[PDB]
Design a protein around this ligand. Structure first.
Ligand SMILES: CCCCCCCC/C=C/CCCCCCCC(=O)OC[C@H](O)CO
Ligand SMILES: CCCCCCCC/C=C/CCCCCCCC(=O)OC[C@H](O)CO
Ligand SMILES: CCCCCCCC/C=C/CCCCCCCC(=O)OC[C@H](O)CO
Ligand SMILES: CCCCCCCC/C=C\CCCCCCCC(=O)OC[C@H](O)CO
Ligand SMILES: CCCCCCCC/C=C\CCCCCCCC(=O)OC[C@H](O)CO
Ligand SMILES: CCCCCCCC/C=C\CCCCCCCC(=O)OC[C@H](O)CO
Ligand SMILES: CCCCCCCC/C=C\CCCCCCCC(=O)OC[C@H](O)CO
Ligand SMILES: CCCCCCCC/C=C\CCCCCCCC(=O)OC[C@H](O)CO
Ligand SMILES: CCCCCCCC/C=C\CCCCCCCC(=O)OC[C@H](O)CO
Ligand SMILES: CCCCCCCC/C=C\CCCCCCCC(=O)OC[C@H](O)CO
Ligand SMILES: CCCCCCCC/C=C\CCCCCCCC(=O)OC[C@H](O)CO
Ligand SMILES: CCCCCCCC/C=C\CCCCCCCC(=O)OC[C@H](O)CO
Lengths: 340, 340, 340
């Protein structure tokens, strides 16, 4: 919501209250997404300032607050700052910003990240370029300097984060993306490579001094029709773990595939069907394993831009022989979102 | 404060800065409410959206930030999300919402929760229906479908929360309330029952597979006069603990009584006297014990709707033989609230 | 940003998104300020209410959110409530407020706290009167009751905080400040003394039952010129630690000196040079040690009141023989701030 707009500075304060529950068999512990209360809320601000006719400054922060913890010792569980960056935009030169932000490969992966609740499984946070990460400097160019409508590109420097856990760490890295869009049709490619920390290399899963990710996507998006596909691969980048005695690390390689179909009726209903498969390969002591394998069926109903409800059923194709212990049961999310 | 109201959506951003100190003998550790700095602040939003002539959507979030922690390792202590829910309201049918919210029995207990600082002792958070809890679906009806001014009712489903601690856990449960109000007089009843988790049943205090709570209240509230009484009982629901070697659990039964009297002068002063007694019964290895026993004397002075100050003296009737180690000393809160 | 102003109540919601990185040799662990991502964001509110012609009420809260943690187990690291207080201001009598707030000696120390990123080294948080602390009641007087333009003074009661750590604890204490300002020239003095907790006295560094701090400062500030000096001393107040086997405590005495020079060009650039030295004395098992010794060179460029960038190079004069293990390498901060 734009709550402030005076003297060339505007501030959008935004957020939402998601009442949300997951239904899964027994424990949920061997299901796709777990079981129980999942209610949370978001809060954030974007600001933009007109510096002059061509120059623009901006900053943005967004925070997650779980609503399914007690007021006791677990109050903070799942609470995090999702985004925090500032930058500048100049006329037809492009934008530069720095802070915690989405990695370039997410420009690709965003194509199928459209399910009511789930999906976008390959866009892990703090995982190099595939989702939100700390310490990205990002340059982006719009319509190729104003010369070429619908063509964009970005380049990114991700600095190293030697965190406590191998899972959240990364070395210095470089990435980019290009996308073209014409009359509801778009295509995208993105690639990034980065060094692994010593602590990542120390883990029993994953071997090698460079993590790599790339993804391509192709989409149809107009006339109330949404269709999109993603195919990606990774090397040494996808976090994996055993379920029982935690040995963790990274997948030596993965193959990712995301298919999405959705239709937007004028009265507000939007059915959605989607299929997602992700498989690891050359995992040590395992060989090949599926990490994600499912079909999805569900629907969102928009009352208006502020209020919605949705159902998301995950038909989980993993099965309980899975060598990594990936849970095999299904999951339904029912939810109700107010947002401003 | 209503900071946004455009195009059928309105957003109230609200909060407060409470400067607050507790005075108690020596340590405070054997007093009613402790001793030292107690300063905190709240932040929150309510939103409401006109979907059509009869249908309304809303969401709400509210957070607590302690102001009496350092900027070091204890920064987060006492910090929690208090409320997070969304729902819908239809014309004369009622409202439905889901998320973290107040339990129905709090519709009763709210009658005496009016002291400057203390009181409302029986409305524990994360304690089934008596205060704030995660995972309530709540339906409410206003003036009985518009047919009956002043008569309300609600029904609630509380889903299970198998938390880490017995104290914060609960099984699935069902509750309700009815209230009638006529010319400053009101009466209320509320009841809820729920299953206990296995981890609640594992504790040395508390015996039984169902927690129960109910409460009734009767009040006078007009012409600057506030008077209200509450009588309630619980089974297996009231959290209790030893002071010295923590054995915890729940009270096999309790009897609760809350009496409140207050007067609102036109210049802004509002004296308040109140008495509260809560006693446990059939506690294992104890028998009967008082949990709460005190008289209260105090006053709030309202400068206006945004600014106030108050004193709350607790004359603590517990005494230092108390078999559970409930502290026996008195406590005074002096405070200063700005709120927007 | 003033987002609300209706009916005698106004609320300024404010904050910022700092994209920020530190450059230092190797680890950073033996540098002045470390090494890596340092991005963070602030959020806060000030409110003010016209109670009548002379009486004014206010409250304020401000929070820090790090943007350089993951979304995993370290999400909360460095997150804290910085300020939370409320009070009242009466006509020409002065203001009284209570909560978490700046200690009086910070009225002095604020003179040299002007570097782009660093500086203000002696204004530790939760350190009696030198920075932010919990439980201050503060009275302040403006222009000496309206009688004397440019002359101010304050008096402060800091109540005890028996925290878990000696570092964050304090006894009851009393402080004050006076300042005079005439045509861009100002001078300030401030002093505070307080009792130490038993847990502070238990530490191997620091000896004595009273912590003391005082500081004086003298400044020039007009015609785009900023110049200011600070000289201060402490007894039993400055937190010190070994680097390798943590023995901690307080410095038996310190001598502080801060010099600052800055120039504000009309186009927006503001170079800054500054020098800071702080040395401990009578430290047990050490004798004398420098805690801070450096020169600073840097610059901020203001695009406007909302958007800036800066560089701050610390030429670190500590050297790697330092008996306490204070890091000896240099540090450069490059940053980009959006603020509203
Ligand atoms: C198998 C891996 C495949 C990876 C897929 C990466 C896709 C990246 C997009 C490239 C667009 C290349 C140029 C396309 C745009 C041409 C310019 C144009 O369309 O318009 C000209 C007009 O003059 C302007 O208004
Ligand atoms: C000992 C335990 C006691 C528990 C206490 C529970 C109290 C619940 C209230 C019930 C109200 C019952 C109906 C009262 C309202 C009657 C309708 C009325 O008052 O008004 C009629 C008029 O036509 C409309 O405008
Ligand atoms: C070595 C330690 C030194 C510590 C340094 C502490 C400085 C504190 C300031 C004191 C000002 C004393 C009074 C100065 C103001 C005099 C009044 C005046 O200037 O103006 C008169 C006029 O009538 C009004 O409008
Ligand atoms: C007065 C104008 C001042 C100048 C305005 C500057 C704008 C700064 C913006 C973002 C910082 C981006 C920093 C990205 C740093 C990554 C470096 C890294 O990751 O490690 C590198 C290695 O140590 C070898 O230096
Ligand atoms: C302008 C800069 C934009 C750079 C975008 C990277 C190129 C498209 C992705 C192609 C995926 C590569 C797949 C094979 C990699 C082995
Ligand atoms: C059951 C499976 C559900 C997924 C449907 C596949 C549609 C995606 C087709 C990809 C077309 C790309 C857009 C041109
Ligand atoms: C397109 C329209 C989609 C439909 C819109 C739905 C609105 C959902 C609102 C709240 C969820 C309430 C969930 C309450 C669940 C409690 C269940 C429980 O606690 O456990 C039950 C047990 O496992 C046996 O299922
Ligand atoms: C319409 C639905 C509203 C239901 C309200 C529950 C009935 C009033 C509380 C009576 C307290 C019961 C006390 C005895 C229990 C043993
Ligand atoms: C000292 C004791 C302080 C409490 C005063 C009792 C008033 C409550 C009377 C209850 C009347 C209910 C409203 C009709
Ligand atoms: C109806 C009007 C009600 C009255 C309005 C009151 C305004 C209160 C404001 C701030 C509290 C400041 C408290 C500062 C307390 C510090 C005391 C301390 O630190 O310890 C002292 C020792 O225990 C010996 O009491
Ligand atoms: C009106 C009340 C304001 C009180 C201000 C304290 C006096 C100025 C600081 C002088 C520093 C003292 C240095 C020597 C201490 C040993
Ligand atoms: C290299 C050293 C950088 C610091 C410059 C010293 C200026 C401070 C002079 C103090 C003058 C006080 C204001 C009258």
């Amino acid at each position: 919501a734009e709550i402030y707009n005076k003297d060339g500075n505007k501030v959008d304060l935004y957020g939402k209250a998601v009442g949300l529950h997951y239904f899964s068999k027994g424990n949920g512990e061997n299901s796709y997404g777990g079981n129980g209360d999942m209610t949370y809320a978001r809060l954030g601000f974007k600001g933009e300032t007109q510096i002059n006719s061509d120059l623009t400054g901006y900053g943005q922060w967004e925070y997650n607050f779980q609503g399914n913890n007690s007021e006791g010792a677990d109050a903070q569980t799942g609470n995090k700052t999702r985004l925090a960056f500032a930058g500048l935009k100049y006329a037809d030169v492009g934008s530069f910003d720095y802070g915690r932000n989405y990695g370039v490969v997410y420009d690709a992966l965003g194509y199928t990240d459209m399910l009511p609740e789930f999906g976008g499984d390959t866009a892990y946070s703090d995982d190099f370029f595939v989702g939100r990460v700390g310490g990205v400097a990002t340059y982006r160019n719009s319509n190729f300097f104003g010369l070429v409508d619908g063509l964009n590109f970005a380049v990114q420097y991700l600095g190293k984060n030697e965190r406590d856990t191998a899972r959240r760490s990364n070395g210095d890295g470089v990435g980019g993306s290009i996308s073209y869009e014409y009359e509801g049709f778009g295509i995208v490619g993105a690639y990034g490579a980065a060094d692994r920390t010593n602590l990542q290399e120390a883990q029993p899963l994953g071997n090698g001094k460079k993590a790599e990710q790339w993804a391509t996507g192709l989409k149809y998006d107009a006339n109330n029709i949404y269709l999109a596909a993603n195919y990606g691969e990774t090397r040494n980048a996808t976090p994996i773990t055993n379920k029982f005695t935690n040995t963790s690390g990274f997948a030596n390689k993965t193959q990712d595939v995301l298919l999405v179909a959705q239709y937007q009726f004028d009265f507000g209903l939007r059915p959605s069907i989607a299929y997602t498969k992700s498989k690891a390969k050359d995992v040590e002591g395992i060989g090949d394993v599926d990490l994600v394998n499912y079909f999805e069926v569900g629907a969102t109903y928009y009352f208006n831009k502020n209020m919605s409800t949705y159902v998301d059923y995950i038909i989980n194709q993993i099965d309980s022989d899975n060598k990594l212990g990936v849970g095999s049961d299904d999951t339904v999310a029912v939810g109700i979102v107010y947002q401003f």
